[PDB]
């Protein structure tokens, strides 16, 4: 299992004519997983420093803030909220 096809879609969106060597995709793959565990981790803690049994979108979001630098977070929050709202406003 891996994020490679997904990295690849995204990749084609920013740089339509650019490719990625496996060695890079490999690093890309590592990168995604790392970020994932960090976010998930801060979420884990957050949730239970509050005697909450659930990690919701709200924990992920505080986590994104606790973990990312300034502009990147201003931007992740944005995309994240955007997605949730779109996911919800459907079905």
């Amino acid at each position: 299992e891996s994020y490679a096809i997904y990295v690849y879609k995204v990749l084609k969106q920013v740089h339509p004519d650019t490719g990625i060597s496996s060695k890079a995709m490999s690093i890309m793959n590592s990168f995604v997983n790392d970020v994932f565990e960090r976010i998930a981790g801060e979420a884990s803690r957050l949730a239970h420093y509050n005697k909450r049994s659930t990690i919701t979108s709200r924990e992920i979001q505080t986590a994104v803030r606790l973990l990312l630098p300034g502009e990147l977070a201003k931007h992740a929050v944005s995309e994240g909220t955007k997605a949730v709202t779109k996911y919800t406003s459907a079905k």
Binding site: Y3, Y6, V7, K9, V10, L11, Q13, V14, H15, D17, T18, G19, I20, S21, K23, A24, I27, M28, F31, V32, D34, V35, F36, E37, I39, A40, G41, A43, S44, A47, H48, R52, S53, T54, I55, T56, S57, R58, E59, I60, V64, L67, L68, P69, G70, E71, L72, H75, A76, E79, G80, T81, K82, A83, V84, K86, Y87, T88, A90, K91
Partner: protein, 104 residues
């Protein structure tokens, strides 16, 4: 329809959702969670490939290799900080020589 299309995303909402559960981070995972985290995840890979991609371009290259990822990261204050304790194999270092060291 997949939950990603429902969420406007290229990263796998359902896979991330599965992953959150096996990571056993909490007794339960609301549906909003994997959606949001798959966004942030896709958002960040977008930023680093956007910047890697140019490094490859600045080097008369078409295929991104680790060196471009490294260039991309170390040359951006935020990614460089987010990634401050991370080693990107085969990446090299940024060209940088202290002044006192140059000819006179």
């Amino acid at each position: 329809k997949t939950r990603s299309s429902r969420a406007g995303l290229q990263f796998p909402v359902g896979r991330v959702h599965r992953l959150l559960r096996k990571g056993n981070y909490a007794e339960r995972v609301g549906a909003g969670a994997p959606v949001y985290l798959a966004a942030v995840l896709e958002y960040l890979t977008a930023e680093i490939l956007e910047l890697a991609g140019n490094a490859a371009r600045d080097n008369k290259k078409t295929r991104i290799i680790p060196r471009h990822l490294q260039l991309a990261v170390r040359n951006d204050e935020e990614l460089n900080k987010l990634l401050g304790r991370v080693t990107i194999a085969q990446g090299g270092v940024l060209p940088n020589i202290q002044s006192v060291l140059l000819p006179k």
